[PDB]
């Protein structure tokens, strides 16, 4: 089973504080609206 990841999976590529800017970076990110497997923990 898969669900909609929406906009999850973005993390800070480094340890520099940045603010009020649009930054283009290439790194290992979760594709937006990609399928992520939905797991259960019952029974």
């Amino acid at each position: 089973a898969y669900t909609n990841s929406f906009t999850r999976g973005v993390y800070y590529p480094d340890k520099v504080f940045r603010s009020s800017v649009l930054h283009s970076t290439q790194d290992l990110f979760l594709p937006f609206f990609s399928n992520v497997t939905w797991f259960h923990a019952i029974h």
Partner: protein, 48 residues
């Protein structure tokens, strides 16, 4: 520990002795223009 500006320069640092954030503001500067009559008349000048 460090912040950066659009130009990639440092905007602020955390003081390693006291954990506070300090801004760095470049010291006041500006152009200087000289208004002068020709040296064929007088050597007195004014500074703008």
């Amino acid at each position: 520990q460090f912040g950066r500006d659009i130009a990639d320069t440092t905007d602020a640092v955390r003081d390693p002795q006291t954990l506070e954030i300090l801004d760095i503001t470049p010291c006041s500067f500006g152009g200087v223009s000289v208004i002068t009559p020709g040296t064929n008349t007088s050597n007195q000048v004014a500074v703008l």
